From a paper:
They are responsible for transporting nucleotide sugars from the cytoplasm, where they are synthesized, into the Golgi lumen where they are then utilized by glycosyltransferases to glycosylate proteins and lipids. NSTs provide an additional essential role of transporting the nucleotide monophosphate (NMP) byproduct of the glycosyltransferase reaction back to the cytoplasm where it can be recycled. The structure of mCST consists of a 10-TM bundle.
We initially obtained crystals of full-length mCST in complex with CMP using the hanging-drop vapor diffusion (HDVD) method, which diffracted anisotropically to a moderate resolution (3.4 × 3.4 × 4.6 Å). We calculated an experimental electron density map using multiple isomorphous replacement with anomalous scattering using Hg and Pt derivatives. A model based on this map showed that the entire 20-residue C-terminus was disordered. The HDVD and LCP structures were overall very similar, despite having very different crystal lattices. This indicates that the crystal packing interactions had no impact on the overall conformation of mCST. ¶The refinement statistics in this column represent the model from the LCP mCST∆C-CMP crystal being refined against the native HDVD mCST-CMP dataset. However, since we determined that hCST, which is biochemically identical to mCST, is a monomer when purified in detergent, these interactions do not stem from a stable pre-formed oligomer that survived detergent extraction and purification.
Author numbering: 15 to 163, 168 to 317
């Protein structure tokens, strides 16, 4: 379920976002959407904490001791929420200035950056063979994702600067969260709550600084339609399900699993719905399979 959710969210999110940034008459503030995602992800996570603890007495006790009463953990988790506030704003900026396929292939440069950050920050080791598989995975998804390289005027060079920042944020913020998540027995849903508390403050401050002038003229929830709330739900679910992947695997295996699921989803579409496929897909799919094989070998 959590692999078929991640693909159908991955498919739906970037297309629905790209649509809502280009086609609107009354256009919404992207900074607010990033902030509202952190609010919803907090409220779902608070819900999940009650379900995990499985008791009102245990839930309340967890909020006191672990959520609100672990200040140094909130201090640590304020760092990646500041970086994710950058990242997610750069993602709305990138999809406003570049094509959906162009964003997709370019943003996979996070996979090398995330692998480097994993080796740097978590003090792990990747062999020469494992490094070969990471770049081969990156080249494999490039071949699978490839598509030709809006009703509004755009700026590609500003769009690529945004993906350059967002790629660096993806590696740093994700691995920082993994570092803090796996440093104790504290629950995933506490760590998410601890993070999204600071996130809501940082993202709301971002909105003030970026769009506060224009928001006074128009309103905070200006341009919001049924499709903007759809995008934010997908961003919230995706955000939560990403933290679950990092919990049960790691920030490198997030990339391999994401790539493997794109190939499995396209193969499911060929068999069930008679989808026509390219030779680039066939070659790229094999590279994704070899990369998983090479990464999955003992040294
Ligand atoms: N603990 C975490 C870790 C990541 N996330 C979200 O998951 C996304 C990570 O995207 P990447 O996998 O592209 O780095 C970000 O939008 C981030 O806000 C989250 O909501 N909670």
């Amino acid at each position: 379920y959590c692999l078929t959710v991640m693909t159908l969210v991955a498919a739906a999110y970037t297309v629905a976002l790209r649509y809502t940034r280009t086609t609107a008459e009354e256009l919404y503030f992207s900074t607010t959407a990033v902030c509202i995602t952190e609010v919803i992800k907090l409220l779902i996570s608070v819900g999940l904490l009650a379900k995990e603890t499985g008791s009102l007495g245990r839930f309340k006790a967890s909020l006191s001791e672990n959520v609100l009463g672990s200040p140094k953990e909130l201090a640590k988790l304020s760092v990646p929420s500041l970086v994710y506030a950058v990242q997610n704003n750069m993602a709305f900026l990138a999809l406003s200035n570049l094509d959906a396929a162009v964003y997709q292939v370019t943003y996979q440069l996070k996979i090398p950056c995330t692998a480097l950050c994993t080796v740097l920050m978590l003090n792990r080791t990747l062999s020469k063979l494992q490094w070969i598989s990471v770049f081969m995975l990156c080249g494999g998804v490039t071949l699978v994702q490839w598509k030709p390289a809006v009703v509004v005027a755009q700026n590609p060079l500003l769009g690529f600067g945004a993906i350059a920042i967002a790629v660096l944020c993806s590696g740093f913020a994700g691995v920082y969260f993994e570092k803090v998540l796996k440093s104790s027995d504290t629950s995933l849903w506490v760590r998410n709550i601890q993070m999204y508390l600071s996130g809501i403050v940082v993202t709301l401050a971002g909105t003030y600084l970026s769009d506060g002038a224009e928001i006074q003229e128009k309103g905070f929830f200006y341009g919001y339609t049924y499709y903007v709330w759809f995008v934010i739900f997908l961003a919230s679910v995706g955000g939560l399900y990403t933290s679950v992947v990092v919990k049960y695997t790691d920030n490198i295996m997030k990339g391999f699993s994401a790539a493997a699921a794109i190939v499995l989803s396209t193969i499911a579409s060929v068999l069930l719905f008679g989808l026509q496929i390219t030779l680039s897909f066939a070659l790229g799919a094999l590279l994704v399979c070899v990369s998983i094989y090479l990464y999955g070998l003992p040294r």
